[model samples]
Target: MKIGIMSDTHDHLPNIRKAIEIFNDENVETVIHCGDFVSLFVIKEFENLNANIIATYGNNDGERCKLKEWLKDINEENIIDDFISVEIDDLKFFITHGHHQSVLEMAIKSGLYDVVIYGHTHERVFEEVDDVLVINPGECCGYLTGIPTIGILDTEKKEYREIVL
Candidate 1:
């Protein structure tokens, strides 16, 4: 299955829309957002997604109560706090915002998941450690840096690549 990965949207609706367009074009089955959505409006923008969404909260995510309330009406199980562990097509995944490098590293080194995904540094990362694939889709908002990006992962093939927006 093909999955889309993104993070640090920071209320950049245009960029988020562009990322979703690409994901739709790629026929992504699911999209995992590592976090930093910022506001409830940005969360609403996710309603436009064509595939299932799984997301975690980031440091800058203000108004957690309102975000959760909105998400409950959409997909209650979609939003999580800090991190989340999910299995897709029999492959385990560990998702986070990467604010705590130690925790991210621990999850990657634990050897308990097939993929480890995080987003916080606003830089794209795609690599493998042992048998685990580690990915960071960069900053979707291009807030910190000028380049906005996202990532696509092929579960069956255990491969991923970043797409610059």
Candidate 2:
């Protein structure tokens, strides 16, 4: 399965739209966001794409109550809080926003899933943790990093590649 990963959009609709376009072109099975959507309107864009999505709350998510209200119409399988454990074909993954604590540290220490997908630092991070792939797709808005990016997890091969946009 081809999965597109992104994070820290921070309400930049253009970048969000670009990422969505890429996902649509890639025909990704699922889209995972690490957080910092900033507003539920951003989430609405993902919904319009008609792709399964899993996202966690970020430090900048101010309208939690409003977000919950918006999520009522979306599929339950796509909405996630804190953490989500998923199986895509044979590959197991643990996905989170990783803002409250050290996500990489926690992922490395857990030794649970084959892959750990996280975001929140706004920088690109891809590493192996005890045989598990830990990934942060970076900020799509290019906020702090200056280079917008995204990621792909090819489940069949159990490999991840980060692409700068």
Candidate 3:
């Protein structure tokens, strides 16, 4: 299963659209966002995606009530929270926005999940720790880093590739 991972959109519509286009081209089965969506309006952009979207709330996502309400109407599977645990094809995943580095590191070092995905630094990271795969899809909005990127993770093969948009 190819899963598209992205983060820190910060309401950048064009970049988000482009990333979704790439994910579609790659035939991603699911799309996981690490957050920083900032507002409820971004949810509409995600609605354009073909795959199911799973997202966590970031520090900037202040309108929690509105966000949840909108998400509920989209896809019940589309999550809007601070953290989430999901299982895809027997592979366990822990997703967060990386606002708390300690929590993110603890989860990665706990050796509890097959994959730990987070975003906040606006930098791309893909590494293995103990048997866990730690990944940060960078900043899809390119707000700080000036580089928009996303990741494609193949659970079956246990490999990943970063796509620059």
Candidate 4:
């Protein structure tokens, strides 16, 4: 049960495709997106992905309803909101867009989640907080930093790695 993690796509199709390619090649069962998808049109590219995606809403995702409607037909199990929680095979995950620092801080300090994932700063972050893993996959759009990246968590082995595209 490998998990793919990514964020801040901002409607950049090329880097998104490259990130998707890596996730598919890695055979991840599910991909967690930390928002900033920007527009629903990009969901078309995501349809090519082999794994399912569990995503949340970002500050730039203004057309929330439209994105939700479009995503339903594409991925039945997908989710979109300011924050969401999922339990994957015994591991608990808390996901959000990091624009709201208070929520992020609370989640990181609460000790309730096995992993806390978010994206907003456009800088890749991989760290730990009291045994809980924290990850920010950077900007897939490469708009701010130019280096597009994503992440993968090996569920069985409990290891995390970053993939740069």
Candidate 5:
């Protein structure tokens, strides 16, 4: 299945809209946001795309409490707190916000998940750690970096494609 990954949007709606358009155009099956969305509205934007969303809280996520209040409508169990692990087909995936632990380091040390995704540094990155895919989908807000970006993870193929906005 095709899965889209993004992070650190920080409530720049237009860019997020663009990414959503890309996902829709590409016919992606699922979308995962690695956090720092900055607003609950951002999550609503993702939901509008009609794609299953997996998200976690970032260090800068100030509206986390509001998110919990609307959790039933959002239906994103992973967005509330620390960690979320989801198994897709043969791959086990982990999502974190890159604050509590160095995601790359944690993934390497754990040796559990087949993929680990997180965003905090706003630097687009993808690497393989001990046979697991570690990714940071960069910043969609274009802050600290000029280029806007997002990512796609193909579960069946076990690969990632970074889409620049």
Candidate 6:
């Protein structure tokens, strides 16, 4: 199964639209957003997504209450607060916003999950450590790196494909 990973969108609607088109075209089973959405209004774009999203809150997410309330419509159980652990088939995944480096590192060092995902640095990452995959899909908003990108995880292959928008 193909799973989509994106982060730090910061309400860049055009790029978000681009990413959605790619994800829909790819027919990914699920999508994960590492947060920094900024406003509650951004959730409207997610209505177009073909797959369900599993998201964690970020520092810049101001309307936390209403944001999660709105997000609940897009994804019920996975409208996560600080972080969450998810198991999809054979893989166990940890999702967080990574504002606290120690928290993010601790999850990685624990070695309990097959994948660890985070954002906030606005930089893309694809690294493997002790049999675990760590990913940061960068700024989907093209604000920091000036590049909008997303990560596609192939569950069967245990690898990631980076898609630039």
Clash totals, every prediction: 0, 0, 1, 0, 0, 0
Comparing 2 and 5 by lDDT, which wins? 2
- Tens digits of lDDT, candidate 4, 75-126: 7877677888878868898999998999999998999999899999999989
Which tens-of-lDDT digit does each residue in 38-72 have in candidate 2?
Answer: 88798787766657887777888888767755765
Off by over 4 Å in 1: none
Clashing pairs in 1: none
Judging by TM-score, tell me the better candidate of 2 and 6. Answer: 6
Ranking by lDDT: 3, 4, 6, 1, 2, 5
Off by over 4 Å in 4: none
Per-residue lDDT of candidate 5, residues 36-130 (tens digit): 88777876776667566677788888877786656537665434556778787688888887776665476756989888888888888899867
Better model by lDDT, 1 or 4? 4
Model 1 weakest 10-residue run by lDDT: 72-81
For each candidate, what TM-score against the reference?
Answer: 0.93, 0.90, 0.95, 0.96, 0.89, 0.96
Q: What's the CA error at residue 13 for candidate 2, in Å?
A: 0.5
Q: Which runs of model 2 end up more than 4 angstroms from their true locations?
A: 102-104
lDDT of each: 0.86, 0.81, 0.88, 0.88, 0.79, 0.88
| Candidate 1 lDDT | 0.86
- State model 4's lDDT: 0.88
RMSD of each: 1.4, 1.7, 1.1, 1.0, 2.0, 1.1
**Candidate 5 residue-wise lDDT at 12:** 96
Candidate 1, 1-165: lDDT as tens digits = 899999999888899899988999987988898868888888677777778778888988878888877776777556666788989978999999988899999998999999999998988878889988888999998878899999998888777888999
Model 3: per-residue Cα lDDT over 1-165, one tens digit each: 799999999999999899978988887888998868888899887777888888888988999888887876787767767888878978999999999899998898888999999998888989998999999999999879898899999989999999999
